[PDB]
From Swiss-Prot, chain A:
This is Small ribosomal subunit protein uS4A. It comes from the Eukaryota. Present with 106000 molecules/cell in log phase SD medium. There are 2 genes for uS4 in yeast. The gene is RPS9A. Gene3D superfamilies: RNA-binding S4 domain (3.10.290.10). It is found in: Cytoplasm; Nucleus, Nucleolus. Its main location: cytoplasm. GO terms for biological process: maturation of SSU-rRNA from tricistronic rRNA transcript (SSU-rRNA, 5.8S rRNA, LSU-rRNA); ribosomal small subunit biogenesis; translation.
UniProtKB/Swiss-Prot annotation, chain B:
It is found in: Cytoplasm. Present with 15900 molecules/cell in log phase SD medium. There are 2 genes for eS8 in yeast. One of its GO terms (molecular function) is structural constituent of ribosome. GO terms for biological process: maturation of SSU-rRNA from tricistronic rRNA transcript (SSU-rRNA, 5.8S rRNA, LSU-rRNA); translation. This is Small ribosomal subunit protein eS8A. The lineage of its organism: Eukaryota, Fungi, Dikarya, Ascomycota, Saccharomycotina. InterPro entries: Ribosomal_eS8, Ribosomal_eS8_CS, Ribosomal_protein_eS8_euk, Ribosomal_Se8/biogenesis_NSA2.
Curated annotation (Swiss-Prot), chain C:
It comes from Saccharomyces cerevisiae (strain ATCC 204508 / S288c). One of its GO terms (biological process) is maturation of SSU-rRNA from tricistronic rRNA transcript (SSU-rRNA, 5.8S rRNA, LSU-rRNA). GO terms for cellular component: 90S preribosome; cytoplasm; nucleolus; nucleus; preribosome, small subunit precursor. Its main location: cytoplasm. Residues 32-194 form the Bms1-type G domain. Interacts with RIO2. The keyword Iron does not apply. This is Ribosome biogenesis protein TSR1. Required for 40S ribosomal subunit synthesis. Required for normal export of the pre-40S particles from the nucleus to the cytoplasm. Its subcellular location and association with pre-40S subunitshifts from mixed cytoplasm/nucleus to all nuclear in RPS19 disruptions, suggesting it acts after the ribosomal protein. GO terms for molecular function: GTP binding; GTPase activity; ribonucleoprotein complex binding; U3 snoRNA binding.
Curated annotation (Swiss-Prot), chain D:
One of its GO terms (cellular component) is cytosol. The gene is RPS4A. It is found in: Cytoplasm. This is Small ribosomal subunit protein eS4A. The keyword Iron does not apply. Component of the ribosome, a large ribonucleoprotein complex responsible for the synthesis of proteins in the cell. The small ribosomal subunit (SSU) binds messenger RNAs (mRNAs) and translates the encoded message by selecting cognate aminoacyl-transfer RNA (tRNA) molecules. The large subunit (LSU) contains the ribosomal catalytic site termed the peptidyl transferase center (PTC), which catalyzes the formation of peptide bonds, thereby polymerizing the amino acids delivered by tRNAs into a polypeptide chain. One of its GO terms (biological process) is translation. GO terms for molecular function: RNA binding; rRNA binding; structural constituent of ribosome. Pfam families: 40S_S4_C, KOW, Ribosomal_S4e, RS4NT, S4. Present with 573 molecules/cell in log phase SD medium. There are 2 genes for eS4 in yeast.
Length: 185, 185, 262, 260
RNA sequence: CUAGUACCGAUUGAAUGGCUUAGUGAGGCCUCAGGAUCUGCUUAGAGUCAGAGCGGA
RNA sequence: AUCUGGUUGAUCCUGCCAGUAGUCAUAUGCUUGUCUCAAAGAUUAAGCCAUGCAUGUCUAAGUAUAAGCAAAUACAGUGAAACUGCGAAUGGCUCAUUAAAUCAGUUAUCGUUUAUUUGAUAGUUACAUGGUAUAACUGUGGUAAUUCUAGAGCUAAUACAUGCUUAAAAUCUCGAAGAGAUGUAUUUAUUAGAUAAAAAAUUGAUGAUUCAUAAUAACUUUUCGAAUCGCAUGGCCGCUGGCGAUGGUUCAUUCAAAUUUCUGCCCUAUCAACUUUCGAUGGUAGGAUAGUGGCCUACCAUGGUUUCAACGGGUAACGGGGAAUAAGGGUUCGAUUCCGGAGAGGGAGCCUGAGAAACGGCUACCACAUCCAAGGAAGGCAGCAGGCGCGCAAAUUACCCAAUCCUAAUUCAGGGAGGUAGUGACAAUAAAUAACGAUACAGGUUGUAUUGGAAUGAGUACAAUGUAAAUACCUUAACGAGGAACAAUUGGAGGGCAAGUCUGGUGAGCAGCCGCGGAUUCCAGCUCCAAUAGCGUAUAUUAAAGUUGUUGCAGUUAAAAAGCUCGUAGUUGAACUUUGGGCCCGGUUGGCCAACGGGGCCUUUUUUACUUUGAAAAAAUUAGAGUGUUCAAAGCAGGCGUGCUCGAAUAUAUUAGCAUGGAAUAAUAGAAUAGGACG
């Protein structure tokens, strides 16, 4: 038979369910950034967990070990590109100081709010899912899309929508027609 | 049929073994030839790879070497006289490798008396040859005394059941003394 | 290990012999017929459409009349079937017909949905007296064709409805498709029904013919299906009450020996 | 199994062919021929996957049956014919010639050669012996047998063969200071010069190699192929001269040039 | 009264499996024989007219 | 990584239990809108099977008078049947047996067979031989019946069987000259295949050979050494010639097979002695095999294994790459996508062939079981689809060779191998169920209620795209929301453990545990909490668990030091032998200098364990570098002008074997009747 397709699980569940102090901290993030699930938080903390595991491992290696040089530089370079880590803090020891809010701040859903365009993080989510936002030429409709530092110049309304320059939507057209027809009465 | 596998034997510790697999074809054996003196009868058998073996059943003449004289002659085989492996082979006149047999002497005498010009018991071209050879006309007394009866002792050196033919050499020296003791005992 | 294995093997031999002992009753033309009853839940359907579409897949037109009971042998499955059709005017006669069946075939319409005042009351009542087995069938789904996806939308609705009463079943066949109708026919021939506890502890038979003799001596012939009969017993007929049998014969004779109940 | 096997499941194929995982269940099994299975390259893989001249297995057969392709100067039509190291492939239309030789990653390169160089190939001497009637012969790695070799030629030497006629025109002795090509194992594809050899009676001899950046490595003698004198290869080398680079060096060059 | 749980232990009832005493033994294969038939040559039947005798399958 | 609750009226311990989280671990209950991706009759029964299909194949180039078709008087296009050749030993399925067996890594054949591919290689013995010959075909028939087949009349070969033709010389035997013999294969016996170095009375290879190869005398019942096919039509005055196809002897090569060295496996002593008649361990000779060997036979000897666990019993036991569980060490699992082994209801035997002890081949017995004219005939789904039975437990009697590849005399035919769609809450990725103003009221720009325009896909559908043809996705004209009924569930509210002094009833129900009730714990209604297209329960297993403890437990009084002493196997065992000091070179890193490493010179100058470096350890999986699949799980791609061009890295992988540097730690050996060293 054909070779197996590989797949993997992307989140982890907190090991004590009813730790009351934790429940409060999670709900503030969801209200601040307009998330729909706790899973959206678990996903981020799962990624952050693995980054620390790798970084902490490398720090056992001596400086000028060729592996620490090669892979350590890759990891730092890759986080700077998305803007999670400042290019001032461009050193491996600072990777251990990142926290969840550093990643949520970079989601397309929040960037479309900080730029204007929308007027709440709840309004921003609606526009993305309804296909009004484009990055460069490509229409994007996923809220969790991580905006790389180059792309921020190119976020704007899509060419093929109202707000972007196309024809009015289905409901505006219906209203104009009935009123025009009645105005002929 | 017959199988040459090791699987059926006990182990060297004495343990008994369970059956691993059915008998394979690549490990077979076959039944013996048991060739007898008679009149020529030979069959053939188709072996692995498409090769052939010849399986002699009855034989009467062979090729025998006069090794110290350096010549070979075809001659008739008279009978079996001694066998190292099993005395029953003597009773039945069965031929195998290393059987001791008597052979008709007359082809060797006719060669000898022409080659050396001397009885074993005419023209310038002949006399000149005999004169050159005459220095080598001496022969072992234990051999020469056999020619009065017309039969010599010989040993079979071919494998008749594998190759279909019976060949050997005349007993000649320390070997002759050894078998004469065994044979008169 | 050997005697472990041996025991398991000879235990399996009993199970397999036991399965044969059950099946021999239906084994062939020499065996007993299986009693099928058709019950359309909507008058739109006409029960003759149901039976006809089944008989086609038997692939012997010699099978295929002023009557409502039919005896059939199916060469394709070497099986004997008796079909009973009730008179859908007489609600009480429906229950009496379905009371004796091994298989009840429920006819559903794709065009008109069952009415609560009548159609459902059939289903509800049959469940509470008990049913030996049941099959859901559709015969007219192509009457709402536009694309067969529209047929599938309806069929899913009917299955969800049907499963409410019979959660053991998850399929309703479409007889307009040869594959389904053959599948239904195979099941009736091959599979065994459930028992009915209160019925099978009694004896019962269905009349092949009836005859009268002089106050009368009514003769019935048929097949035994319950626990059995004895000539000293008493016999109930649902519309008429209790009566005494005087003789039995096997198609040897048995007679009511008067050392009997009264 | 009761006899020889005709199929090769994908994933079991040699990794240096660079087949993808998902496009099918099977891989082309090489026919019996001049080169060992594990280290040959079937023609289908060359025409389809490397040169892109064909889109399908079917189109590859359409090319071969027109007799456009010849290997070592002879026309071949078997789709799974096993070409191998040092062979010359010629496409007459398009007017192109290629020699099969390894990249430093240990893959067969697409290496173009002139119409002049297509006349000859090199061969490693595998044995030398007397045949019937007492005629001596040599055997090369690609399985040719050549009558009447020069009495100086010995095992492990390398021999230059004219593809027309098929006769020896030159040879080089195995000795220190020769150039070598590594043709197996972890160091496959590197080039250097012989420093010295280790004798191990009843075992495997080892050879010490130095490259032009004076890195050193060791390989079994079986993996060594002589290709010329110091600084004078008898054949055109592939791009990059067989100099291995560390992963840090490669990253720097790409972003320097390709990344400007 | 009924339910549940077991022991012996009678029939071998009537079977299944391991070990074992005695006796027998299908089939193909190898080998000593047999020769329904078919056919070559030969003094010789006629210008196919027989017979004999020496071979092969 | 390092939790919480439960033993006095009141406490601290030991100890076990309950709770919690994961599972490429199965089942099951309630619920279910969108995109991508995808396991699936293993567990019980290696149980039984209706019907259909799964292996055949032709080019210019073996054999054509079809009374086939279609249009160069022997033939000439295309082409059914049939002979001939090749294939059917691969693939696909399953896991019953099997515990030094299979298997893994690492070796060997100087111990052997090999269709095919590739490369070499036969001056040595008629202008074309015969039926000891026949299929398809024509024609006469038998039987209830099958891929049953008889009698008669025709004719081919790359089938079968026979049999010729081509140089010169040299050497040896016999005998003045003459005459005779010699290729290759088979069987035997002899011969060569050299070698450290000097003076007198020609020669190959290996660590290693009875190697490769050659020579002499013979042997064989007599091996091979072209009675074959296509295309083209040249040269010289009836002679000579080209490019291919198919065969054939031996050697080498390739795809392979068989045997084989070293080390490694789960539980059990309520298994301590086991093997040898009837091969157990060894020697000599023979037989048999492709070949080594007690593989088998004759004769002879008395051996072989074991407390460092033999032999016996058990496994709900095919081995490995691997999977789950992340502080570290471990524990549990691996029928199942790749590699190796075994089997085709159970045992045994064998034909054909390069290759089989074959089961979509045959023969017999044992157990099942089909048709019948009752005489006979036929059988093997642990291939694909499907049925019965079993059970907690698993899909359609669908379409196609378009892709991946394989087989054949072959570009063309065939392939349930393989692909496509159907069924599918096994597991995995992304993500709808509403956003924003006005007005009224309250608050400092945020809450609570009447009211208004905008936005969109779920769904449906013209079209194009997709595809072998289709469905769906991606794109799109028209239609498609106000209780936006286009209406989100599953478990809880005393504690462990987030959240009710609410309210009505009652005096069977709840509860893993402690407990409630003759009511904050039941039942009903409000309200509230948690996870959410998902949530609950049962069983097994891992972590928390230091309740299996090497890291790392405990034994006065809580479970646990044997009445006491001796003693074999096993584990363990005191100190000591070249140390110090000078003088050069010297690389790396940081400020000529310092530190840290390394080499050389001088000064009286046997055998193992351990550790470093290197080669090896298949791919997939794991860790990990690059790359806007719209993001992601994935994939191995893809960039740039609008022909050019970078890639498909790297690491890890106990133990055993191989090569190499070191000399601390721990073992072993040496000169004492000197029988010692240097001489």
């Amino acid at each position: 038979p054909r070779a197996p397709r590989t797949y993997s699980k992307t989140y982890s569940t907190p090991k004590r369910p009813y730790e009351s102090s934790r429940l409060d901290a999670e709900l503030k993030l969801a209200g601040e950034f307009g998330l729909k699930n706790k899973k959206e938080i678990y996903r981020i903390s799962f990624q952050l967990s693995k980054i620390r595991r790798a970084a902490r491992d490398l720090l056992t290696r001596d400086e000028k070990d060729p592996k620490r040089l090669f892979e350590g530089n890759a990891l730092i370079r890759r986080l700077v590109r998305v803007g999670v880590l400042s290019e001032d803090k461009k050193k491996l020891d600072y990777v251990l100081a990142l926290k969840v809010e550093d990643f949520l701040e970079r989601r397309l859903q929040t960037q479309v709010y900080k730029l204007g365009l929308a007027k709440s993080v709840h309004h921003a989510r609606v526009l993305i899912t309804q296909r009004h936002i484009a990055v460069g030429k490509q229409i994007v409709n996923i809220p969790s899309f991580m905006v790389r530092l180059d792309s921020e110049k190119h976020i704007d309304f899509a060419p093929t929508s109202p707000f972007g320059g196309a024809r009015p939507g289905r409901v505006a057209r219906r209203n104009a027609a009935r009123k025009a027809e009645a105005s002929g009465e | 049929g017959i199988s040459r596998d090791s699987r059926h034997k006990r182990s060297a510790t004495g343990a008994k073994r369970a059956q691993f697999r059915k008998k394979r074809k690549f490990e077979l054996g076959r039944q013996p030839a048991n060739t007898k003196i008679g009149a020529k009868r030979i069959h053939s058998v188709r072996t692995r790879g498409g090769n052939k073996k010849y399986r002699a059943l009855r034989i009467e003449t062979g090729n025998f070497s006069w090794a110290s004289e350096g010549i070979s002659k075809k001659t008739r085989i008279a009978g079996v006289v001694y066998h190292p492996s099993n005395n029953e082979l003597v009773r039945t006149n069965t031929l195998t490798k290393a059987a001791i047999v008597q052979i008709d002497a007359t082809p060797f005498r006719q060669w000898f008396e022409a080659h050396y010009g001397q009885t074993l018991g005419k023209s310038k071209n002949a006399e000149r040859k005999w004169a050159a050879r005459a220095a080598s006309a001496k022969i072992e007394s234990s051999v020469e005394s056999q020619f009065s009866a017309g039969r010599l002792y010989a040993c079979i050196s071919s494998r008749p059941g594998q190759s279909g033919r019976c060949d050997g050499y005349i007993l000649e020296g320390e070997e002759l003394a050894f078998y004469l003791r065994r044979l008169t005992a | 290990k050997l005697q472990r294995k041996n025991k398991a093997k000879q235990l399996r031999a009993q199970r397999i012999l036991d399965s044969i002992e059950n099946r021999k009753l239906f084994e062939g033309k020499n065996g007993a017929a299986k009693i099928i009853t058709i019950v359309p839940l909507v008058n739109d359907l006409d029960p003759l459409d149901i039976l006809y579409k089944l008989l086609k897949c038997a692939d012997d037109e010699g099978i295929m009349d002023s009557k409502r009971i039919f005896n059939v042998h199916i060469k394709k499955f070497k099986s004997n079937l008796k079909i009973i059709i009730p008179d859908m005017t007489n609600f009480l006669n429906i229950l009496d017909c379905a009371k004796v069946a091994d298989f009840v075939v429920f006819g559903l319409s794709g065009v008109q949905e069952v009415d609560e005042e009548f159609g459902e009351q059939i289903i509800r009542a049959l469940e509470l007296q008990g049913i030996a087995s049941y099959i859901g069938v559709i015969s007219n789904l192509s009457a709402v064709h536009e694309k067969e996806k529209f047929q599938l939308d309806v069929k899913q609705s009917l299955e969800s409805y049907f499963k409410h009463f019979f959660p053991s079943e998850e399929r309703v066949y479409n007889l307009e498709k040869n594959s389904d109708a053959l599948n239904v026919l195979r099941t009736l021939c091959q599979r065994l029904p459930r028992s009915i506890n209160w019925r099978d502890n009694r004896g019962y038979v269905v009349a092949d013919f009836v005859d009268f003799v002089e106050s009368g001596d009514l003769v019935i012939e048929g097949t035994v299906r319950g626990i059995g009969f004895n000539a000293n017993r008493l016999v109930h007929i649902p519309d008429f009450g209790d009566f005494q049998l005087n003789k039995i014969e096997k198609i040897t004779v048995f007679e009511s020996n008067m050392n009997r109940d009264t | 199994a009761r006899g020889p096997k005709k199929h090769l499941k994908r994933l079991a194929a040699p990794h240096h062919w660079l087949l993808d995982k998902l496009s099918g269940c099977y891989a082309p099994r090489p026919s019996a021929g001049p080169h060992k299975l594990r280290e040959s390259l079937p023609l289908i893989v060359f025409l389809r996957n490397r040169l892109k001249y064909a889109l399908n297995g079917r189109e590859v057969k359409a090319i071969l049956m027109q007799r456009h392709v010849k290997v070592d100067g002879k026309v071949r039509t078997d789709t799974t014919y096993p070409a191998g190291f040092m062979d010359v492939i010629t496409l007459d239309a398009t007017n192109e010639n290629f020699r099969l030789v390894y990249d430093v990653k240990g893959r067969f390169a697409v290496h173009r050669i002139t119409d002049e160089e297509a006349s000859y190939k090199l061969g490693k001497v595998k044995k030398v012996q007397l045949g019937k009637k007492g005629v001596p012969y040599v055997v090369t790695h690609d399985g040719r047998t050549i009558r009447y070799p020069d009495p100086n030629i010995k095992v492990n030497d390398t021999v230059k063969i004219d593809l027309a006629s098929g006769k020896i025109t030159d040879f080089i002795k195995f000795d220190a200071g020769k150039l070598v090509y590594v043709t197996g194992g972890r160091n496959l594809g590197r080039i250097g010069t012989i420093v010295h050899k280790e004798r191990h009676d009843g075992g495997f001899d080892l050879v010490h190699i130095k490259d032009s950046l004076d890195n050193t490595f060791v390989t079994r003698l079986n993996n060594v192929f002589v290709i010329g004198e110091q600084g004078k290869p008898y054949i055109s080398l592939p791009k990059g001269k067989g100099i291995k680079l560390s992963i840090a060096e490669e990253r720097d060059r790409r972003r320097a040039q390709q990344g400007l």
